[PDB]
Amino acid sequence: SMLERTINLYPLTNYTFGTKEPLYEKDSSVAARFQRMREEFDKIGMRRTVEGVLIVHEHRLPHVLLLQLGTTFFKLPGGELNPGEDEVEGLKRLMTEILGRQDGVLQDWVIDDCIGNWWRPNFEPPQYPYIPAHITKPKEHKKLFLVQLQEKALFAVPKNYKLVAAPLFELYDNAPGYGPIISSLPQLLSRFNFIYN
Ligand SMILES: C[C@]1(Cc2cn(-c3ccccc3)nn2)NC(=O)C[C@@H]1O
Ligand SMILES: [Zn+2]
Ligand SMILES: [Zn+2]
């Protein structure tokens, strides 16, 4: 009757947030983003993205780590898989590219839980937690995973990003602020048995 996954959380003060060089988006605009998605869909088919949910606490209040591009949009650490690339190896690679240390010490990502799937039916912003009716060729499949952090770690945050710890209450029913994936993380995380270390 204990059917919940147990996840260790550590205080945000256990983590060091260093800095490194800016990491630029492949796309300079929404228009270029959907143009490249169109181009790549014709060459290699559906885009496969992976995103990591990294959780900490302060004073037993869980917080999700988000990347803020300057003071603009909020994203999860993650990105695009290469064709034939394993989802979990790919998320580990992407989280190393974004948050990995300037001193090149190997970081230990633990990924054991899928927490959701989102599908983009068109070359347009809307994403859904299912393949919508009549859609046979979704343009993007996004996979979210829970990343179990170590007790302590040093992260290097690209100088053009801020790493922000968002409490769940701030995400909850805040799609305008965070969009439909990040704003549904409180619901998606509720099944876990968090231990506040
Ligand atoms: C994740 C977002 C925002 C967003 C809005 N919608 C949505 C869903 C249903 C109906 C109308 C809008 N889905 N995702 N999509 C992007 O392309 C980047 C941005 O972060
Ligand atoms: Zn406390
Ligand atoms: Zn799919």
From Swiss-Prot:
Residues 51-130 are annotated as: Necessary for interactions with PAPOLA and PABPN1. The modification Phosphotyrosine is found at residue 10. InterPro entries: Cleav_polyA_spec_factor_su5 (IPR016706), NUDIX_hydrolase-like_dom_sf (IPR015797), NUDIX_hydrolase_dom (IPR000086). GO terms for cellular component: centriolar satellite; centrosome; cytoplasm; mRNA cleavage and polyadenylation specificity factor complex; mRNA cleavage factor complex; nuclear body; nucleoplasm; nucleus. Acetylated mainly by p300/CBP, recruited to the complex by CPSF6. Acetylation decreases interaction with PAPAO. Deacetylated by the class I/II HDACs, HDAC1, HDAC3 and HDAC10, and by the class III HDACs, SIRT1 and SIRT2. The keyword tRNA-binding does not apply. Belongs to the Nudix hydrolase family. CPSF5 subfamily. SUPFAM superfamilies: Nudix (SSF55811). The record marks 25, 33 as: Interaction with RNA. Residues 3-117 are annotated as: Necessary for RNA-binding. Homodimer (via N- and C-terminus); binds RNA as homodimer. Component of the cleavage factor Im (CFIm) complex which is a heterotetramer composed of two subunits of NUDT21/CPSF5 and two subunits of CPSF6 or CPSF7 or a heterodimer of CPSF6 and CPSF7. The cleavage factor Im (CFIm) complex associates with the CPSF and CSTF complexes to promote the assembly of the core mRNA 3'-processing machinery. Interacts with CPSF6 (via the RRM domain); this interaction is direct and enhances binding to RNA. Interacts with CPSF7. Interacts with FIP1L1; this interaction occurs in a RNA sequence-specific manner. Residues 72-74 are annotated as: Interaction with RNA. GO terms for biological process: cell differentiation; co-transcriptional mRNA 3'-end processing, cleavage and polyadenylation pathway; mRNA 3'-end processing; mRNA alternative polyadenylation; mRNA processing; positive regulation of pro-B cell differentiation; positive regulation of stem cell differentiation; post-transcriptional regulation of gene expression. It comes from Homo sapiens. Gene3D superfamilies: Nucleoside Triphosphate Pyrophosphohydrolase. Expressed in the heart, brain, placenta, lung, liver, skeletal muscle, kidney and pancreas. This is Cleavage and polyadenylation specificity factor subunit 5. Keywords: Acetylation, Cytoplasm, Differentiation, Methylation, mRNA processing, Nucleus, Phosphoprotein, RNA-binding. The modification N6-acetyllysine is found at residue 26. It is found in: Nucleus; Cytoplasm. Residues 46-171 form the Nudix hydrolase domain. Component of the cleavage factor Im (CFIm) complex that functions as an activator of the pre-mRNA 3'-end cleavage and polyadenylation processing required for the maturation of pre-mRNA into functional mRNAs. CFIm contributes to the recruitment of multiprotein complexes on specific sequences on the pre-mRNA 3'-end, so called cleavage and polyadenylation signals (pA signals). Most pre-mRNAs contain multiple pA signals, resulting in alternative cleavage and polyadenylation (APA) producing mRNAs with variable 3'-end formation. The keyword Thylakoid does not apply. GO terms for molecular function: chromatin binding; histone deacetylase binding; identical protein binding; mRNA 3'-UTR AU-rich region binding; mRNA binding; protein homodimerization activity; RNA binding.
